[model samples]
Target chain A: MQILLANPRGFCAGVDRAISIVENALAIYGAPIYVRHEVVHNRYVVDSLRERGAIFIEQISEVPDGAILIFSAHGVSQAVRNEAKSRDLTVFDATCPLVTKVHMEVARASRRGEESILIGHAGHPEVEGTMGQYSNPEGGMYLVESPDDVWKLTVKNEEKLSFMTQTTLSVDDTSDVIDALRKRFPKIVGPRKDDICYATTNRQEAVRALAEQAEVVLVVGSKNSSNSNRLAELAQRMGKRAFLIDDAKDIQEEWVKEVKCVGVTAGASAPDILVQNVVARLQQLGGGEAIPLEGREENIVFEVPKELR
Target chain B: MQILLANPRGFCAGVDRAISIVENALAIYGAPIYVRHEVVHNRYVVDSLRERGAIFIEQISEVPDGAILIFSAHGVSQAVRNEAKSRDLTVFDATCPLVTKVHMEVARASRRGEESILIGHAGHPEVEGTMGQYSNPEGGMYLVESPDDVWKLTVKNEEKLSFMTQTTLSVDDTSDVIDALRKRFPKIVGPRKDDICYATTNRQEAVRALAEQAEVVLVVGSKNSSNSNRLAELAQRMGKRAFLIDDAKDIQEEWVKEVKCVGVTAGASAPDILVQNVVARLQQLGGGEAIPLEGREENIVFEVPKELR
Candidate 1:
């Protein structure tokens, strides 16, 4: 039996920074460092942090006033920041730099008096935070998920429009949607550069690379890891048998009963330990040995919070 | 700001059917109706179900012998199913029909004495389920991910090969990956139909439309939802300001500061309540009222399991 290992697997820069923020805050403040949500979407990371005295909360109301609060990597709405302030809470923002870029874009568009459209998943922490940048109770931004939404779309001023999106998304899907928007709203305004971060794009590209090679592909990551799930889906879409698992134990000997080759990868939030375990498990399963499938060279890194240093 | 609501958003037939299976089963079977992990990835959905008596377990071992258990919507490994049978537990499979198709494909390939290649995320419930179909502990199935991987691939017998994939994936990415696989492996076999489910494709398409017209877009879904997160990311890739929100309350005034139009949509597991709340919040924020975007009428429906009936 051989093991196949995936390169550039586990813990993208955003996840690293987010986790660092929580850890640093805990070390600095000592115990009960309140995190508004999971720093990222991994159970293992969150569990470890919790054991280290980090307290996860669903909302601001749950936190006691004046507690040291750390935002998750997913980011938070401006309103949340304000709430923390009103409560006299000391804060450390752990939002990924990419997500923060989108927020800045929204703020810029709003300041220009241009109605902004944010393209992203509803309810994601990052989206909530970005929306907080422009959401006014008197009626604020618009959300669209498809070109069809254009037909009934009624803008206060059609000409003054701009848009942005979540950092992690399918490049192809986003292109098609953008095409539709350009066709419908010819004069729409937006960032001159694409908003998706490099890590998300590179990961998808790597998965695409893996899908083209293996008969079966495996993505290692937690169930809640977004980028990891996308990698698995990309392989499947290419018509290969792909699966997402958290670790080695989750691999089924049966699924690859007749498979001779396998491709393995991981999500942004997954740990390297999980990927290594998956490789070991695959080695125990059959005659095929693990191969290293090279991926895009990722050199991008975000600065850790000043407090961490 | 004008709110553009994407139509045909939120839970699709397969996801709806799968989730309903668990919910209905829980209602009928009573507390501790064991589920093989999360019925879906959405934390809110899982927590809600947990509150309603669903007990998520990582393996059948977690369930006592003869206990009733429901499979998750993402599906499960065959080994788990066999264990259930051996234990003589009352069981109901909540696997989405689309996912079931991949499992069948692998089984058929194995029966024909051909090696199977799975294209999907590793360790995901669906991948584990599909992989479980082939129990040949030795040289049977293979996992493939991309075109480059084809160069390093070593099959048991290239002539006798078949492939399948998970149901949720980006359409364009899959096509490219498939093209590479078909070109490199002359003997590689595939399913008569594409493995990606309609919901995944359609929802992605809808988001494409939303990204076109709305200056900003919001996808309503849980962070853990693969398809929903994809939709949000897709919009961002289009260079639009997109956001993912769980509900309207997550909306803030900063998001619409200069926006005249917005687009909104949801994931398969997301309920309409979130969408409505978003619309209401937009209205309150003076997003210039709410309106539904034009869309193709989707009337697809799946019948409930006999147990539910």
Candidate 2:
């Protein structure tokens, strides 16, 4: 059986920068760093960081006064930013530039008295942070799960409606919701440059193509990673058997049986080393040479915060 | 078994006016009156009108030159209007005021450069007419099916979006979709007064209440009636055994066999005579007195055109 690798899979510019921020901070200031939320939505990344003295907390209250605090790549709300400022902790923000752009758009829309429609899942830190950034002269910012939400929507001023989306949301899913917005509210506007990433869309496109050629597909991502989950879902939707696995050990023998070709890819926050291990495991499973399809090479890069720089 | 009826079930003011317009035209104009589409959705209404020399034609070419042409209560596009004017035919519009109000909103949105998002089913005459009325400075007018559609939606401009709904669309269904619009486009606006009817909502509410207590429900409406279909769907959604029957003969004995209380209703365009037949059939099957729960009595009336009056 042939093992096909998808190009542009795993470790996007933002994820790379985020991990670097944590490492740089650890290198600059010795041990016991407190990070609010998972630095990125990857279990492997969190576990590895934890061993190096990076303690993850849900609330800012968990961090002791004077300890350095690092915000996750998913970002934190203003309440969190404010809480950090009020305390004696030195802070480093590791939010992806794409997510921060959504935050800024939310702030802009609110200042303009525009109701901000956040297109994303509820309860994710990114969603909370983006929603939190909304300056509601009127109220708590809202999230829309589907086109159904758009149909029942009401706002103070129809002309003042705007939308923002999370970077990791499924591109296919967001397209439908955005299309509904355009259909329901011709005047409803969104980010001038959508915060939902090109990397996410590109990877999804690769998975779609891979799903077309392969009978079974595997996505290398931690359980909680949204983009990784989306990749698996897209493949399943495309009529191919798909699974989201963290690394080589998660690949089942049954998955490799009877399938002539296996498609493999990773989530944006997932390290490529995991992809290599999966390839190695499949080789040991009696799979032939790994063949990969070419995808557009992503070149965008983000820098770490200055204190660590 | 007890027979419970929903008040305000049959023949709304608009339907009454539409039928009257056709009847009055037949009275004044003599035999062979030409009407476009079904004068109303009810099959019985159409057949009865046909027996009285009211000729129903789907295409304008079906009518002979110099004949009288009347639009259905659903409405017609400008293209249809222009076609009638260009020919030797005399035209009388029978579009419901609520539907006409939607057409006007579509026109208004078009002139204002706003993309009109129509919230209703595709292919229905009212939806077709409303979409046709959109003077796309850009292109064809659009419609959205559900919150799923909203998620997939995209348009030329976000700030110029507006939506309109059909008079008969399920109020509960439209509400979720509208909610999505509001969430996705915080600045997005809709009709100042929604074109979707109060009658539709009130009836749905009645059916929901009825379904809660009744074991089985029957809707007396033609196969094509949107409101009637919605009533049946609503009951089924509430976990009751529901059927949409045109008259008494359509009700199955098995449906009545296991039920203690039967709920009955008719579409907005359906004549109450059909509801009476349903009640009579159930009564023959050993049902008790037909008790109707009180609904707001509709007082609004629409007058026929000057020529008929």
Candidate 3:
């Protein structure tokens, strides 16, 4: 069986920068550094961080005063930001810059009292952070999980409206929601372009190329990893049998019993080593040559904080 | 069989004004007055005008130089406008006000040299007029008939992209196309609210209400009438059998032979007499009572040119 590997998968620039921030903070401040959430979403990566003495917490109350705290790559709400401030915790923001761009849009639109719509998964940290940025107590920020929600969306004033989406979302589905909003509210304003991140888009593009030739597609990502889930879902959308696995051990041999080809890809938060291990496991199960499909080249980089440098 | 008459159908404010423009033009300027194209999309209305001495021409050369000429309600292109001016012809605009709003968008975006996408049917005057409004020689203004066109769309530059749609179109289908554009070009700009007129939206909404109770629907309109086509298509999309007819005579008796209910409506350009005639014909074929459904009220009015008024 041929194993088709998708190039330009695994870590994106934002994920790389996010992971680097956590590593730099730990190196500079020594052990027992506190992170507001998992610095990055992969289980294997989180476990590796935990072994290196990083403590992940959802609330500010868990951290002692003066303890170094880093925000997760998904970003944090203004409420979370202030809560950390109240405790005077030394903080390093590991929020992906692309996610930060969406927060900026929400804050600006909120200041103008513009009712906005956020297209995203309800409970994700990025959605929480973006929605919480809406400053108007009375001005609304409606959360829409699907285009159906857009049909039911109501705002205090239809004239003064805007829309935004979470950075990590299905590119096609998010556009469908945007389409619904534009039709229902002809005057509604939004970012000139979408707020979806480059990593999510590039990875999905590569997965499409991989899914075209591979009979079974495997996405190496934690179940909870949002972008990782999309990678698997995108392959399934292309009519390929796809699964999201946390690591190599989660792959089902039953899926590959007689399959001629299997495609391999990783989410932005996933480590490349997990992908390599999956490759090895596939080989043990009768996989022949591993070929990387040509894809877009990404050279974007975000600088680490000054102190870390 | 019961005839369900869709409320808010036929003779929209724009169409009313369009027909009124020709009537007033004939009243004020007398016979031999020239019109650039069919004043409206319906054959019945144009036939009525032609019987009253209104002459419709597709070319400016057909009208004698200095003759009084009126623009159609669908609007005209910059080329046509310039052509009329060069002949020194007296002109009166019968273009719909809602359509004018879309033209303003095209002009404004064009002045900035922004490439734009126009969502509308090919060969329709509104699409031709709106697409011709672009001022940039090197910049592009593309016409997209469907969402698939959006996928094939490529602009000279991505950052300064904008999109607009014809005023008369299917609300749901147009939204689907808009969804495609927004996804393909994340930074694409467009009007806040849809460019679709109130009449089209109200008529479509009424059709949905009518289709909910009717098994078969008859739309009173000329085959070339754009909005009329949408009314028929909208009902079909709702899983109801629908037909587009020029008048009562076009109705197929077999369509309502045993159907319990038949919904009847007319396009914006269609005359009320056509809708009433359809209702009368349905009853002839064993259709029981003709009932009007509750729908949106439209109070819009566009005044005629100063000379005609």
Candidate 4:
């Protein structure tokens, strides 16, 4: 039995920056700092932060007026920003810069008098944030989850339409939707760079590479983690037996009985320690050797807020 | 023997407008009125206009300065527009209004700081003219003939990208290419309405219906007619024996020897009289039954220019 660990599989720059923001806020502001939503999607990360006095709340109204409030890495809508502003809460925006880039594009298109079409899953915090930025009373932003949804779009101006996407969507799926939008609206404008973050792309690519050699693939992350679930789904869709597990304890021993080779990867929010633990558990269960697969080395980093630093 | 005539066959509104522009120009301006290119790809249309003093020239320079020069229905590039302006020629643009609509979209995208990707075949007069519209020395327009061509595109700005298509592309083929583009550039914008004209669509639909009951399908138009060739190709691809012919004179006797039912249709530029001649010839060969196939009724008509009217 062999264990192949995918390179560049753990914490991305954005996740690292987000976790650091929460840790630094707790260290500097003392315990009882409020975090809107899980700082990141990992239960392990949230549990560690909670142990250090980070209170997770779903709504802004739950926090006291003058307490410190840190926005989650998934980002928040403009309405949330205005709510925090009115409450006079000391805020640290831990929103990933890539997500913020999409927000800026929506605002920029609106300022230029163009309507925007967003391609993303509905009800996602990131999608909700991006959609909420277009605050026109009559609605300036439209959301499309798939190619078919584009047919239902009724824009005020055909010539002045632009499109954007969430930072964590499947590249192939998003492509189909974008193509439908273009066929329906030939004059629509698109973003200069892809909105899907480099981490999601790299991980998916790594898994594809891993799928070529492994009979079974395991992804380490929580179910709610968008990028994590995508990694597992992508691997499975590529014909590999794949599973999304929180840690080594969740691994079912019965499934690995006939598996000659197992490929292991972690989501962006998942820590490297969880991946390492999974590899160790696989070794104990008769996996002969662990090998690191050749993959892209990610050195990208996002800066912490000035006050936090 | 049964001769199945396509209901929507013969000259379309755009073709009518184009040919009328040439005839009206000759009637008003008298003999020797210069036309840039064959007005609509059909030699019969060109020859008739030529006998009426419409001299077809490939280049704007071929027309003597200050002459009455008419642009073809396929449209002209910006360079030709500039050249005509420079020569001080009296020009009547017979460019199809549908083709002009695509041109307007490219111009609008440029104005909004977006470059355009044009989906069209190379060297076709309409493509050449459409590509010529973006005169930016840095090149504002890029031509993509198929979905595969999209991968090779390296745009200066991805966020400022949009797409347009020729007015005569097959709907399914165009849809595939457009899908490829959207996948590559999810942020890419497209036109409000499809660039394919109503006449081309109706004719293709009519041919598809005709192909159902006919053993062989005959498309009547010159070889150079893009939409006409597409009609024949589409029928052949759909499992019917199909051939494109200029007129009844080009029809090979061997093709119809064992044919029980024959489907006949004309390109947008081919005259109804040509269709009638083909039906007469088919009847002369003992196929006296001339039955019009049930298809969509096309009442669409584009008015000739004010001067021509």
The C-alpha RMSD in Å for every predicted model, in order, reads 27.6, 26.6, 25.1, 26.7
**lDDT (10s digit) by residue, model 3, range B1-309:** 888999888888788888888999899888977998899988999998999989999998899976789899999999999998888788888888778768878988889888988999899999989998998977889999788988897789987799889988889888999999878987788754467887899999999999999999999999889999999999999999999999888888888888998899889999989888888899999987789888765544555655666
Task: List, for all models, the DockQ compared with the true complex.
Answer: 0.01, 0.01, 0.03, 0.01
**Worst lDDT 10-window in candidate 4 chain B:** B296-305
| lDDT (Cα) of model 2 | 0.83
lDDT of 2 by residue, B254-273 (tens): 88995789988888888888
RMSD of 3: 25.1
Highest TM-score model number: 3
Candidate 3: residue B300 lDDT (0-100): 44
Best by DockQ: 3
| Model 3: colliding residue pairs | A186-B192, A186-B193, A186-B194, A187-B192, A187-B193, A188-B192, A193-B186, A193-B187, A194-B186, B1-B288
Return the interface RMSD of the candidates, in order shown, one decimal each. 23.3, 29.7, 24.5, 26.4
Q: Each model's TM-score, in the order given?
A: 0.49, 0.51, 0.53, 0.52
The candidate, 1 or 3, that scores higher on lDDT is: 3
Per-model TM-score of chain B: 0.92, 0.96, 0.96, 0.96
Point out the worst 10-residue segment of candidate 4 chain A by lDDT: A297-306
**Quick one: how many clashes does candidate 2 have?**
46
Model 1 RMSD vs true structure: 27.6
